[PDB]
Design a protein around this ligand. Sequence first.
Ligand code: A5P
Ligand code: A5P
Lengths: 258, 254, 258, 254
Amino acid sequence: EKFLVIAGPCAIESEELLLKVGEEIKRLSEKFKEVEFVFKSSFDKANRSSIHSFRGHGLEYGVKALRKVKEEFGLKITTDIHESWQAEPVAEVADIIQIPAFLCRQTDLLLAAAKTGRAVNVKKGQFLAPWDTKNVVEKLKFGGAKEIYLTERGTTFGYNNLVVDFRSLPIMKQWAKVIYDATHSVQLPGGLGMREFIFPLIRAAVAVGCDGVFMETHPEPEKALSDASTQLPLSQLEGIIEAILEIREVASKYYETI
Amino acid sequence: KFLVIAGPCAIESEELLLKVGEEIKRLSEKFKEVEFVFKSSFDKANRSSIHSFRGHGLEYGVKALRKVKEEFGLKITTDIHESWQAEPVAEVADIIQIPAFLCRQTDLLLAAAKTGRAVNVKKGQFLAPWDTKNVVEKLKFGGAKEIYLTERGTTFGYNNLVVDFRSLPIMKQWAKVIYDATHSVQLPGMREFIFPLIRAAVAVGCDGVFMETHPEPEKALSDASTQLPLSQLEGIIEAILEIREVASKYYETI
Amino acid sequence: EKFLVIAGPCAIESEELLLKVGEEIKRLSEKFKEVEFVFKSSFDKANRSSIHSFRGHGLEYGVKALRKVKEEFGLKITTDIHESWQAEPVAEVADIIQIPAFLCRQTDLLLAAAKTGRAVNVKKGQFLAPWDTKNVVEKLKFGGAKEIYLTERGTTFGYNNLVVDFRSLPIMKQWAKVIYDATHSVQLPGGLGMREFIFPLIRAAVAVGCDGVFMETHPEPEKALSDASTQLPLSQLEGIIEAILEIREVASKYYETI
Amino acid sequence: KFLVIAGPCAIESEELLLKVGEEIKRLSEKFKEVEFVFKSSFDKANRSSIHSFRGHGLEYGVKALRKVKEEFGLKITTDIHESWQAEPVAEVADIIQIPAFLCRQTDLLLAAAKTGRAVNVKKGQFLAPWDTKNVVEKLKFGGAKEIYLTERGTTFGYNNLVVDFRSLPIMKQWAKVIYDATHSVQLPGMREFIFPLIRAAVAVGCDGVFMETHPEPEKALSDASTQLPLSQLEGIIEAILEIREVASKYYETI
Ligand SMILES: O=P(O)(O)OC[C@@H](O)[C@@H](O)[C@H](O)CO
Ligand SMILES: O=P(O)(O)OC[C@@H](O)[C@@H](O)[C@H](O)CO
């Protein structure tokens, strides 16, 4: 099956930033034809720790910006919603509606996404056990979703630290397609993220076996308005993708059947 | 004075609320050294299963809660799940409760603070004690003045929560601290640990306790494995007041 | 039942240090007649993180030092063993033989302690669940122990941090007398301990209900050769003990029956 | 070259060791790019229950291990539990293994290093990756030169272990890192996760893998729920070599 790579800048800092990243993603999509790319960026960071941190430029602006990417590059789009009313307007441009990790159990949000007819990707709550995502998929299927994704993004391990229990990939694979979040799984919740572990954990994810990877990328991570410690420099994206396809290929014959 | 927030988990019917309201009203008359707050949810917006009881809706709920406040003169508190609910709920709720999973949702916190009512934030199972300083800052920025932080356990492996009582003194630096005696022992819950841990909460030091109670916990449509039997409420309250009276002499300053 | 207070300097820095602490413990034992005191100190810190840290002056020296305390003050004695051969010689002076937390599952060490006829106190491993101590008691009873204690000293919570799950006290009470370690439960494993939490957690322990408390105390913690961040200043011991007896008394009528 | 440490959990009989030794000897001939080490414990000194199988003693064990090294010319490794055992065990064991619970016992580490043999320390379930730097220092101080640190999971709530693969690159700064594929999935263990995680171990990067194997894992007197079936060993080895060959191009330096 075609491997999914969901990538893009964490936040929609500007339509310019999006075009620059989309251009590179478009180029890579032409090179890695066996990969299905999906451009990602949030119109709002509705859960920042601090009230003084960057949130965004509003839903209206973001959807317009994302639509420009899809139009100019012909790329699939995904972004996250935070309250039920946002699903409808977002569904106009988003091919995949993303459900934030903290909100993975909010019934109305999941139902709002499911009825749009779009694909839904739920980030696994840092508080949720692998086997507890079964009910999450049941809610989505009940709400009309026909294409569902579950994203591994780490689990609460003591304070201000997350650990990735890779046993979760085959467990979740039982009821949904699984995506590995390479950049948020190494972040330190309220710490201020460890970038040196992004690549190795990604290798692990593909050797274990998943249906795709989620990576936040920015031309200059050091200048990002969000996740400046975890976003991957855009120049490194090509090499990372090439590496996971290679590892995925050689490990593929050993993937267990669910 | 010491705060005691109690009531049934979900508004199963205004009937149920009135019955519990009666008992809470009685205790209220018996323990003048305690500020009682009637609590109940108009919607269980985060059940694990789509096939579980959620409730009768916001209007039926705000209605029944109005009936309790008017028939017993008790303060009220219930939780909101989306920004638009803050305003209508603030009509009856003296304290607006923010769900644990939603403690980082900026707009929800701001919407709550905007109503001018008191705000109680359940500490997320993913949050470290010191991470709550930022939750309070948001509320203050939003105009909130009476702010509460509730301890309800922290993620400890899978399907288990642990109470790190170091959290009470830490959170107290920036807000009044409430201990959730019923949800802190639930397994994402042995009722046998409810009383022992509430005793610890008061020996350590907190500004109030949160307890879900029901005439017949087993028949409850929600948290049936942890809701405290109504008849046991008085006994526990008297016990925590006695322990608090003695232990308060040693509560550390700030 | 008579409340147990196990206290003393972490390590046997010198026989002088022991006499100074024992003198104060002896004085307190005369004041708090409803308490059963047991003087504690280790002749060896066999599990320090660093090879350059203080271990002790040997078994021979320590046993002699402890015997001096028991002789000069008439106090019960307890110290920990690290290998089977030490039980016999230690049993000569120790009323209670202590089993280190990391060694709570070493069968021969437990059996070695049990056959001396002395009381045995096992520090609960930071890796052990409350209900798993049942087998630990079974091993001791099998080995001849007739007076067994289980000590709560925290559980691994992420890296370099321990949390105390107070549900463990009533659980362990089902098969042994339970002791709460007030000073090691707030230490940060390999961190360099948070002294400001010692007192509040002790209040919690007695309000929940336990059969005794374990506290390391030193005249000048800042100068200790071990646990300088967790040892309680000897001047504060009297007040702490008075406080727990008061809290224990008022909470006592509510202790659940096992 | 890549290290593969394998054998039955406990020395149930020199008979069992010889059978497994035969298969390991065969793989040894088939995979020259791999250094195989035969492993088995003469004593299970830390069983939870007093009524569980421990073994046949140190002499019967060191004897049977001698038979394997002499009949197949394989390197040997077994674990010690008290200082006095280092010397007699060093007679046959090429690598002395230090139990996870005992990774902080200074005298045991020193006793092992004193023999002059290689030393493999199982990382305690209570230890953080960076805390192993001190474990190595002790060994070096004791005269050890060939030092190994084995990843075997970390305490995650109760009765569960999680593998934080960030530990492999961290521990590599001061020692050769081995991944314990069988004990890392055991619940203080679904065999279904053994292969997937070993694949991750090699994709991430390690110097060898540790695997307990038995002709009939179910009949094993120890770790019966996690011991890998002897027949599946070859397949897994070939798989990790292939993955390693491809992934090694991306292993980070130091
Ligand atoms: O405000 P801070 O704590 O930096 O958090 C931001 C990240 O957690 C955020 O971008 C993420 O995708 C949402 O949780
Ligand atoms: O060597 P460090 O890490 O300071 O450790 C010492 C304490 O953990 C020690 O005194 C304790 O009683 C034994 O584990």
